[PDB]
Amino acid sequence: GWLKEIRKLQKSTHLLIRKLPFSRLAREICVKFTRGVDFNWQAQALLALQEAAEAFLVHLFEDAYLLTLHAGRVTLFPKDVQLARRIRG
Amino acid sequence: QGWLKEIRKLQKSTHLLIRKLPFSRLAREICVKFTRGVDFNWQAQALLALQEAAEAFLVHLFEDAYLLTLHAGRVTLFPKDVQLARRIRGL
Amino acid sequence: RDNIQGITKPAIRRLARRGGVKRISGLIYEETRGVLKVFLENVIRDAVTYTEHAKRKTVTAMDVVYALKRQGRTLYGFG
Amino acid sequence: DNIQGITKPAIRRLARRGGVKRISGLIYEETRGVLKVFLENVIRDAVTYTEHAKRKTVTAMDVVYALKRQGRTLYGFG
Amino acid sequence: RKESYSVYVYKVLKQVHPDTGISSKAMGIMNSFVNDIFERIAGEASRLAHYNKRSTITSREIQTAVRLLLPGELAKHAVSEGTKAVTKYTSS
Amino acid sequence: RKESYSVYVYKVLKQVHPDTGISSKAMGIMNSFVNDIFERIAGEASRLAHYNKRSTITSREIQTAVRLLLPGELAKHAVSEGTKAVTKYTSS
Amino acid sequence: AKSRSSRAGLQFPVGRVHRLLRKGNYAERVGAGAPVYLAAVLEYLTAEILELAGNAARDNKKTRIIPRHLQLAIRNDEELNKLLGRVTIAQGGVLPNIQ
Amino acid sequence: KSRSSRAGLQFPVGRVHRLLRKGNYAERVGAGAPVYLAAVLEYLTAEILELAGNAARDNKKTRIIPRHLQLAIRNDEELNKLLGRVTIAQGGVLPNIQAV
DNA sequence: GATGTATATATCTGACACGTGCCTGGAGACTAGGGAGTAATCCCCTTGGCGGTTAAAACGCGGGGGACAGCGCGTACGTGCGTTTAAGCGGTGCTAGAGCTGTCTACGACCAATTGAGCGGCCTCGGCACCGGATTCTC
DNA sequence: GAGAATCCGGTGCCGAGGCCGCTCAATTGGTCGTAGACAGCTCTAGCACCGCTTAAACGCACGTACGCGCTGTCCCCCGCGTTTTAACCGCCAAGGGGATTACTCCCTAGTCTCCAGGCACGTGTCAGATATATACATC
């Protein structure tokens, strides 16, 4: 079932989060930390944010899934993600 | 009981939990194997410095690795826990 | 109007399949939407500072590369 | 020997400081193992500084600088 | 002949506390504290003299280095105190 | 007017490989590789000009920085290759 | 005939920081207003951590600061724990932390 | 007569010496250092690109793409410890599958 | 055994390896002055050892405490499938914004005299560490 | 409902803070080159939007694969008491080399001058991308 889905996604390299929702999220979060000022992201830097966010989330879910196989689970509960951040610090 | 008193006692004082001369002989044995032939002088404060770093590192490692035994429902550590705790960080 | 639900219910599933997780639970969809948000603050607040210093309203790629290098997670591919 | 100086009650007190309630038995090997694979990466990263300034004596500042470069910053002993 | 920062920490401690003594070992910790933060900030602000292709270190670069190297509320109090020091330094 | 390290990586690739092409994006990675290692070593050896209270950077400090910044076998090959370059540089 | 810290209204020195910031080779040109600001920042940081340490010192019915008090004053406060994360204070010990 | 060709290198020597003068690293820069530095950088570049080219050859493609550098870094042991805190754009991951 | 699973080629599509012009940063030359490498020295910090004690570690033992294996109920999750909504292409406009080229000025290196702020050595005495004693707490 | 945990007091002891001598490094002051703030102009590349269109998400119905609590079993760390042992304290000798000073010398830095190399620009053309179609691998 899922096994044809993993081995297709660990082969390709393209982005998974779509570009426009991530751009709207970045323009939302950026305007709170600059005292209500807009900015103008270059069209290259949003790719850098998105690549760092994808790499961080993929490494995070790999470590969380390494935690899930320890306790006999296969399912990835929210107890698992909030514990793989306090260990890493 | 007993352990409930020992955790309260050892977390209060700030001593050295490892004896001096075995740790010093271990550090000298490791230092001999690199760039052989010559000996190496150690100042008496440097071995204390390295001992404080090693004790703080091992205490932080056990306190970090213990949280993967309450998570599995167990009470007791295992070498799987310590090796997984080093696997998470990247050391 | 949702503003964080642009991260969808299966985009988290695609990231978990890339990570190699067989079966996601439920409230993960409400958890990851927290964590990502926190991480973006510790880039963007760290990246809006450098572009504030050089009198530029444009947030270039080099600024995000420098902020990610300062956080510890070095990024290479852009510049 | 020269490794069995780190005895069983030594590692036991190192664990009881960390909040560990109940300890297994095989830990007393792996911890010694990881102790060695710590100290090596502090020793040679120290002694290169000792081989740079051409003296036969490892000062305390050399070990502080090796731990500085390693990641775990140490205070006090400077 | 080998200087340190013991006297100044002792003066600050006698300022913000009436008679609280400090041992000769813990004072050493304070040396390795404040020979360290000065290594970060006045190191890292030097990096901001290189990305913008400059050659000076003015107060503005140290201000941005304090905005980076400290968490939120402590950074806000520090940047509020530093310019308060500078303004009464300028009108000497 | 804004230099890079593309031509030299291309020459090394055509040296150790006959016709293996390299894309214009991955070459960019090589730029951010070797504008990075040079930031470490020639940064960190500068620190060894400060602990020993010196003011120069000779070959010996770069040699010790390579002994520090690299793992074992790669560091041994690098220190064996660098002095081999220096000795045929000296007798010019 | 007149001190730099006395114009600064501070307690940490100014000429020593300026001397280190020239001799450290951080930049080839040092602005004049910089080390006063930097010394004020260092004074506020040391004042904050000693102000947090002295309360725990009087909490243990003591008047002489030992490193355990600095360990507790670092680890109990949130923002200093964010700052001094990867630092092992010598002779320090750990927090009382059970279960 | 150039200092690159005099030492038998491929990386430049004058540019590295220019970046060590204007880099604020020490007050004086010797002459025996930057040739050593360029030699070490050339060895590391060849070390990466050999594995990258072999992994590109085994995928039956005559062009180097960042997935190939990702595979060559994460399959090598030494560069796993040298580059252990590095994300790579257009990267991907290793083919990691594990069961219970 | 139909559903993947690998391969032939279609062509088409654009990146890219390459060729040229060209501006400027790297090489040749050489003086000069501080950095330092070598030589000597003397003390000072470390190493080695005698010896005696005393906490501290090693070892049997048994007993409860916990880990592990099976198992039943069930519920929260994957999947199939129609819809409907939002994301991408791509095209236009089109203007704020990087940047970069002069200028002139405040400003910081650079340097001679000079003196007190801070560093080294010393000497208590109160703070504190330890040892012994009197007042609570759960099984 | 009494051995164990907490607070209290007394006494030695030893380092923390006050004090003096002093010296060298920070201050003051006058000089000059220049780094950078400041203004204005010019190309460019990012944002807003819109029409389409269509790929994917959304919502739901349902079957069922794990989550979890329970329980039985068996093994396995911890507390305890005895024996053994090496860590430590204090001393005493001695000596290897760490820190300091002198002195010459040499090697890198600055400035000038000359031109070969590395960068921006432009262009045919092969590498692959995706797409369709067809020969193997399999629960």
Short mmCIF file of N, CA and C (backbone and C1' of nucleotides) in Angstrom, two decimals, chain F residues 21-26, chain H residues 63-65, chain I residues 13-17, chain J residues 122-129:
data_model
loop_
_atom_site.label_atom_id
_atom_site.label_comp_id
_atom_site.label_asym_id
_atom_site.label_seq_id
_atom_site.Cartn_x
_atom_site.Cartn_y
_atom_site.Cartn_z
N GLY F 21 30.64 16.22 -17.26
CA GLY F 21 30.16 17.58 -17.12
C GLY F 21 29.55 17.84 -15.76
N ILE F 22 29.40 19.12 -15.44
CA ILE F 22 28.84 19.56 -14.17
C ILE F 22 27.84 20.68 -14.45
N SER F 23 26.68 20.61 -13.80
CA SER F 23 25.64 21.58 -14.08
C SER F 23 25.97 22.92 -13.44
N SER F 24 25.25 23.95 -13.87
CA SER F 24 25.50 25.29 -13.35
C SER F 24 24.91 25.51 -11.97
N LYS F 25 24.13 24.57 -11.44
CA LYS F 25 23.64 24.72 -10.09
C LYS F 25 24.55 24.04 -9.08
N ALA F 26 25.00 22.82 -9.39
CA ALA F 26 25.85 22.07 -8.48
C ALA F 26 27.21 22.73 -8.31
N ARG H 63 26.34 13.99 -16.35
CA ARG H 63 26.25 15.33 -15.81
C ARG H 63 26.09 15.22 -14.31
N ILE H 64 26.69 16.15 -13.58
CA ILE H 64 26.67 16.12 -12.12
C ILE H 64 25.54 17.00 -11.62
N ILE H 65 24.69 16.43 -10.77
CA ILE H 65 23.51 17.11 -10.22
C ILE H 65 23.57 16.96 -8.70
P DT I 13 10.01 22.25 -28.24
"O5'" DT I 13 10.05 21.37 -26.90
"C5'" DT I 13 9.92 21.99 -25.63
"C4'" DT I 13 11.28 22.28 -25.02
"C3'" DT I 13 11.92 23.59 -25.47
"O3'" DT I 13 11.62 24.61 -24.53
"C1'" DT I 13 13.51 21.78 -25.23
P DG I 14 12.27 26.08 -24.68
"O5'" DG I 14 13.53 26.03 -23.70
"C5'" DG I 14 13.41 25.40 -22.44
"C4'" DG I 14 14.76 24.91 -21.94
"C3'" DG I 14 15.75 26.01 -21.56
"O3'" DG I 14 16.42 25.66 -20.37
"C1'" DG I 14 16.72 24.58 -23.16
P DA I 15 16.99 26.80 -19.40
"O5'" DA I 15 18.44 26.27 -18.99
"C5'" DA I 15 18.56 25.14 -18.13
"C4'" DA I 15 19.80 24.32 -18.46
"C3'" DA I 15 21.12 24.89 -17.97
"O3'" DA I 15 21.99 23.82 -17.64
"C1'" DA I 15 21.14 24.77 -20.33
P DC I 16 23.38 24.09 -16.88
"O5'" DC I 16 24.38 23.10 -17.62
"C5'" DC I 16 24.12 22.73 -18.96
"C4'" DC I 16 25.39 22.79 -19.78
"C3'" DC I 16 26.52 23.56 -19.13
"O3'" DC I 16 27.75 23.11 -19.65
"C1'" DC I 16 25.91 24.66 -21.06
P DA I 17 28.63 22.03 -18.85
"O5'" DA I 17 29.95 21.89 -19.74
"C5'" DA I 17 29.92 21.10 -20.92
"C4'" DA I 17 30.49 21.87 -22.10
"C3'" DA I 17 31.89 22.43 -21.90
"O3'" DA I 17 32.72 22.03 -22.98
"C1'" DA I 17 30.42 24.12 -22.70
P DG J 122 25.28 40.18 -25.00
"O5'" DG J 122 25.57 38.95 -25.97
"C5'" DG J 122 26.57 39.06 -26.97
"C4'" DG J 122 26.77 37.74 -27.70
"C3'" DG J 122 25.49 37.05 -28.17
"O3'" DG J 122 25.72 36.53 -29.47
"C1'" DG J 122 26.76 35.56 -26.87
P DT J 123 24.50 36.02 -30.38
"O5'" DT J 123 25.09 34.71 -31.08
"C5'" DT J 123 26.17 34.01 -30.47
"C4'" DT J 123 26.20 32.57 -30.92
"C3'" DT J 123 24.85 32.03 -31.36
"O3'" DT J 123 25.04 30.92 -32.23
"C1'" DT J 123 25.49 30.94 -29.39
P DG J 124 23.98 30.63 -33.41
"O5'" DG J 124 24.10 29.06 -33.66
"C5'" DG J 124 25.18 28.54 -34.43
"C4'" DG J 124 25.83 27.36 -33.73
"C3'" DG J 124 25.16 26.01 -33.94
"O3'" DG J 124 26.14 24.98 -33.90
"C1'" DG J 124 25.08 26.55 -31.66
P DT J 125 25.77 23.46 -34.27
"O5'" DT J 125 26.50 22.62 -33.13
"C5'" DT J 125 26.42 23.05 -31.78
"C4'" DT J 125 26.00 21.91 -30.88
"C3'" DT J 125 25.15 20.85 -31.56
"O3'" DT J 125 25.20 19.66 -30.80
"C1'" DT J 125 23.83 21.92 -30.00
P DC J 126 25.75 18.30 -31.43
"O5'" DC J 126 25.80 17.30 -30.18
"C5'" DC J 126 26.79 17.48 -29.16
"C4'" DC J 126 26.17 17.40 -27.76
"C3'" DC J 126 25.56 16.06 -27.36
"O3'" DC J 126 25.77 15.85 -25.97
"C1'" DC J 126 23.90 17.73 -27.26
P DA J 127 25.62 14.39 -25.31
"O5'" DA J 127 25.32 14.71 -23.78
"C5'" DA J 127 24.77 15.97 -23.42
"C4'" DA J 127 24.00 15.91 -22.12
"C3'" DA J 127 23.64 14.53 -21.64
"O3'" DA J 127 23.36 14.58 -20.25
"C1'" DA J 127 21.73 15.62 -22.59
P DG J 128 22.75 13.31 -19.49
"O5'" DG J 128 21.19 13.64 -19.39
"C5'" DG J 128 20.73 14.71 -18.57
"C4'" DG J 128 19.26 15.04 -18.82
"C3'" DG J 128 18.25 13.95 -18.46
"O3'" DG J 128 17.03 14.57 -18.07
"C1'" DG J 128 17.95 14.52 -20.67
P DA J 129 16.71 14.94 -16.54
"O5'" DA J 129 15.33 15.72 -16.66
"C5'" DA J 129 15.05 16.47 -17.86
"C4'" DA J 129 13.56 16.47 -18.18
"C3'" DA J 129 12.73 15.46 -17.42
"O3'" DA J 129 11.39 15.89 -17.38
"C1'" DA J 129 12.81 14.84 -19.69
#
